[PDB]
Design a protein around this ligand. Sequence first.
Ligand SMILES: CC(C)C[C@H](NC(=O)[C@H](Cc1ccccc1)NP(=O)(O)CNC(=O)OCc1ccccc1)C(=O)O
Ligand SMILES: [Ca+2]
Ligand SMILES: [Ca+2]
Ligand SMILES: [Ca+2]
Ligand SMILES: [Ca+2]
Ligand SMILES: [Zn+2]
Length: 316
Amino acid sequence: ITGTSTVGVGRGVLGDQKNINTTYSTYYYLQDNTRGNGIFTYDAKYRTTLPGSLWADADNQFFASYDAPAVDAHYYAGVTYDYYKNVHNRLSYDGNNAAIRSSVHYSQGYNNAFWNGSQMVYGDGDGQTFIPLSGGIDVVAHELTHAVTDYTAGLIYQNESGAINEAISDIFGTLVEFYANKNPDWEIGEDVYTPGISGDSLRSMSDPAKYGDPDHYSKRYTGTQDNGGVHINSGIINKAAYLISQGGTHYGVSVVGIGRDKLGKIFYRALTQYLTPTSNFSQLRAAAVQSATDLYGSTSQEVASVKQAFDAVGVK
Ligand SMILES: CC(C)C[C@H](NC(=O)[C@H](Cc1ccccc1)NP(=O)(O)CNC(=O)OCc1ccccc1)C(=O)O
Ligand SMILES: [Ca+2]
Ligand SMILES: [Ca+2]
Ligand SMILES: [Ca+2]
Ligand SMILES: [Ca+2]
Ligand SMILES: [Zn+2]
């Protein structure tokens, strides 16, 4: 909408206060004009038609319980925007500052979030398996990263290419979590998963097997559920990414960690310059080796660590 940029204040899903960029035109709208061609957050009003209505508020104060999922979808989209711009020189998900749109309060009791080809969509959770999923910065950056993937590598959402697609979203969700630096970890979805159980999460990059996902290619799932295991076999690549960054000895293979920033540079380059819609794990290893070579040189520690990490998870 046309109007003047303003700054509202509210509380997110976990009860934290934050400022949000709004637009004033009779109402205050969740429209952030300070980033690209805008960040827009919508109310889906517990139904499934999208996007719903642009979020409108009479006084620019967002402290109602109903407001909290919108506050966080809007604010964490801004953080993820800033990560890609500041860290990778990428302007929004298409590289050309496309408007970023999110809807919250999708459906009823909805235990998921997704990128529908055009926008991010967040359920409120059923209060037991999940709380509103936009309360997790790793969830929001996981979803915006699906858009990035779709505009770059284009990884098909099934079997090995789909598990790479999923790992790319968990990896950058985690790097954005560290970027914002609030309780960062290598776990996935812990801020919004199982409110009655502390300390758990939906997936783990540091130890995928903790929640039954494979941490070696020999343990890969090859049936048909979950699009051929895309949220399952992602654990093989998440573990490799964790090892590249943090190091460790896994099934007897030792990896020298090179840190998060260099993991992010290497995988961003792989995603945008070498992966294609049909890449499999072995082709991801090659793409990451070539990306590290480009960035740090063929005889670097960074290249050797990438090789060690994929050897450790059984990917040649
Ligand atoms: C239980 C569920 C949340 C797990 C899993 N979903 C997820 O892991 C994440 C949500 C998330 C939760 C916690 C941390 C980070 C991300 N959702 P996602 O984006 O991977 C769901 N993808 C998805 O819905 O893909 C199907 C699709 C929809 C529309 C258009 C084309 C294709 C799944 O869908 O199986
Ligand atoms: Ca208000
Ligand atoms: Ca965390
Ligand atoms: Ca996390
Ligand atoms: Ca929990
Ligand atoms: Zn995903």
